[PDB]
Enzyme design. Structure first.
Site, PDB file in Angstrom:
ATOM      1  CE1 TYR A  81       1.808  -0.042  -1.941  1.00 26.84           C
ATOM      2  CE2 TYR A  81      -0.243   0.579  -1.009  1.00 26.84           C
ATOM      3  CZ  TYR A  81       0.752   0.940  -1.982  1.00 26.84           C
ATOM      4  OH  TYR A  81       0.767   2.054  -2.699  1.00 26.84           O
ATOM      5  N   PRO A  94      -8.133   1.310  -3.929  1.00 29.27           N
ATOM      6  CG  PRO A  94      -6.495   2.841  -4.609  1.00 29.27           C
ATOM      7  CD  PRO A  94      -6.670   1.570  -4.248  1.00 29.27           C
ATOM      8  CG  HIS A 317      -2.681   0.853  -3.942  1.00 32.43           C
ATOM      9  ND1 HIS A 317      -1.586   0.949  -4.720  1.00 32.43           N
ATOM     10  CD2 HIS A 317      -3.272   2.210  -3.949  1.00 32.43           C
ATOM     11  CE1 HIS A 317      -1.560   2.250  -5.100  1.00 32.43           C
ATOM     12  NE2 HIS A 317      -2.580   2.822  -4.806  1.00 32.43           N
ATOM     13  CB  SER A 528      -4.476   9.949  -5.876  1.00 33.08           C
ATOM     14  OG  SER A 528      -5.836   9.427  -5.759  1.00 33.08           O
TER      15      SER A 528
END
EC number: 2.3.1.137
Length: 599
Positions: A81, A94, A317, A528
């Site tokens: 990230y 998300p 995230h 996911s």
């Protein structure tokens, strides 16, 4: 949470080199040519030869596990990230669509927002006091660290790599949230001087003041700046905070417990695409003329309350993992259903502080560039929301099969039916059985899944053989899943070996420059699961240009699905994928039900 609980957690292990490499080769078989596999087989042998390269990197990881609480944590956060420079919008953060509420006017919108805020604060009290129930799985403790990273935190742009700030347990923990309406941010205290939190009643009153203080959308949408590429935003951010008031406003936003977005009315759209548009609103805001400017995407937690009753959230995230989000969502949505107590008289309340931004030609130009970039991003995102009503966890469970494994195999079948071959597929596995554990990779494309998908469409394979291949593929996935959760997967390990080499300043190992590795890490299917009790679902963009992003929440009798793709890639189509997935799920059910075990 509980000190004793965390202390009893095993540390993240370093799998044996031979184990991970053998699993790696097995996972490559269905996704690379016989030629590329034979070569990788050779490279792997060379890599682990006695006194060789791999042997030393492994010892490096072992020394690392001895000195750190978790050998992978920092590395994972950084590489996955902080060092990822694409915009966090769509490509990283998300979005989640929650059950639509019944309000029909602004008052109702503010009332719900007020209830939600109170619900999050209720959840927070458990985190602050560490009274949050400790969790287990199969009798083994699960790390609770993830829960203490989502509130009062924010991502901070950096010229080379970003960072994350968390004030939950600082000297003077934040007592305010930020509210944004019509692109204007406000600092709202949600705790009285005596530490007690404000009631939904008191919160509504404050939200009413905020709404009135920003009646028109007549201010530049500074927030939209957070949706641009990370290298671009780092510079625009540096310039933005040169001004004292701007810096103060940014600081208040960064320290806020969380942000609540009171979205504006948007145009009507045909019913058959309504859910797709709402998903868009939650993921990216819908555009510069809609609600994208009513956001601060660096913020870890952003709860969105739409004008038409819809609601959801988007989380950053880098700082937030899936588990804590699910827990928070389930807790909040229930809290919003609990019976409100009798209204106790109300005391005076201060005016929520408006967090102003001094606009300059440079900042204005940066905003215009951000609008242009976001418009391009949105125009390229193809989202299809699917409510699979035929069945949920109920059918798979009736067949003694893992619902998650069942869904993953169905996706493998759907993909094969469209493209005639399998592809590198990613499914997240939770490493919470280990201290500070985040995630590892479950690879859904396997020898068994490929055998099944091929046999499913092979006229020469008897249905009885097809059903046996199906059960083997599902059971094989379940096994991979259980192994990954136990730290026996190989993707983070291989990443570790690569990073170790980088740090040791040794020449990049051949195994990492290998074409097979490139194929293995290019996930045409990135998935996911959002195992929430709340009837909701998440969504995100594909991790590669020619891929799909598939999210799902299996409920008892139906499954919530989201399928994303990029228009710039002519070979992908979200609608077509959703259609095939639905048929795959159905065909697997039909096959199983017509070819049962024995009486």
């Amino acid at each position: 949470s509980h000190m004793a609980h965390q202390d009893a957690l095993p540390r993240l292990p370093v799998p044996p080199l031979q184990q991970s490499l053998d699993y790696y080769l097995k996972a490559l078989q269905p996704i690379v040519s016989e030629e590329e596999w034979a070569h990788t087989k050779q490279l792997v042998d060379e890599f682990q030869t006695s006194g060789g390269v791999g042997e030393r990197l492994q010892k490096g990881l072992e020394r690392r596990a001895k000195k750190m609480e978790n050998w992978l944590s920092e590395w994972w956060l950084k590489t996955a990230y902080l060092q990822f420079r694409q915009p966090v919008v769509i490509y990283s953060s998300p979005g989640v669509i929650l059950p639509k509420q019944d309000f029909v006017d602004l008052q109702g919108q503010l009332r719900f927002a007020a209830k939600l805020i109170e619900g999050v604060l209720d959840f927070k009290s458990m985190i602050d006091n560490e009274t949050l129930p400790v969790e287990f799985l199969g009798g083994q403790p699960l790390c609770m660290n993830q829960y203490y990273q989502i509130l009062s935190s924010c991502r901070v742009p950096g010229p080379k790599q970003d960072s994350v700030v968390n004030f939950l347990k600082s000297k003077r923990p934040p007592t305010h949230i930020t509210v944004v309406h019509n692109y204007q941010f406000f600092e709202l205290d949600v705790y009285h001087s005596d530490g007690t939190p404000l009631t939904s009643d008191q919160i509504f009153v404050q939200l009413e003041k905020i709404w009135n203080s920003s009646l028109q959308s007549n201010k530049e949408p500074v927030g939209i700046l957070t949706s641009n590429h990370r290298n671009t935003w780092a510079k625009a951010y540096n310039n933005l905070i040169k001004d004292k008031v701007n810096r103060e406003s940014v600081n208040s936003i960064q320290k806020s417990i969380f942000t609540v977005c009171l979205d504006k009315q948007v145009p009507r759209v045909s019913d058959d695409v309504y859910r797709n548009h709402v998903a868009g609103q939650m993921l990216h805001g819908g555009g510069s003329k809609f609600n994208s400017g009513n956001r601060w995407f660096d913020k870890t937690l952003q709860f969105i309350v739409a004008e038409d009753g819809s609601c959801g959230m988007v989380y950053e995230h880098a700082a937030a993992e899936g588990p804590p989000i699910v827990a928070l969502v389930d807790h909040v949505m229930e809290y919003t259903k609990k019976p409100e107590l009798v209204r106790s008289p109300m005391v005076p309340l201060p005016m929520p502080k408006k967090l102003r931004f001094n606009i300059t030609p440079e900042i204005k130009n940066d905003i215009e560039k951000a609008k242009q970039n976001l418009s391009i991003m949105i125009q390229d995102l193809d989202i299809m929301m699917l409510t699979f009503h035929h069945f949920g966890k109920d059918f798979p469970k009736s067949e003694k099969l893992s619902p998650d494994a069942f869904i993953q195999v169905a996706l493998q079948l759907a993909y094969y039916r469209i493209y005639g071959q399998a592809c590198a597929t990613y499914e997240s596995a939770s490493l919470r059985m280990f201290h500070l554990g985040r995630t590892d990779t479950i690879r859904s494309a396997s020898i068994d899944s490929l055998a099944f998908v091929k046999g499913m469409g092979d006229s020469t394979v008897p249905e009885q053989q097809k059903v046996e291949l199906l059960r083997k593929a599902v059971q094989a996935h379940r096994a991979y899943t259980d192994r990954a959760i136990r730290g026996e997967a190989f993707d983070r390990h291989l990443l570790g070996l690569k990073l170790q080499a980088i740090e040791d300043l040794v020449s990049m190992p051949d195994i990492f420059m290998d074409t097979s590795y490139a194929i293995a890490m290019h996930f045409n299917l990135s998935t996911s699961q959002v195992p929430a009790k709340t009837d909701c679902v998440g969504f995100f963009g594909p991790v590669v240009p020619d891929g799909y992003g598939i999210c799902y929440n299996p409920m008892e009798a139906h499954i919530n699905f989201s399928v994303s793709a990029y228009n710039s890639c002519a070979e992908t189509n979200a609608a077509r994928m959703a259609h095939y997935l639905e048929k795959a799920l159905l065909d697997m059910r039909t096959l199983l039900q017509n070819h049962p075990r024995a009486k």
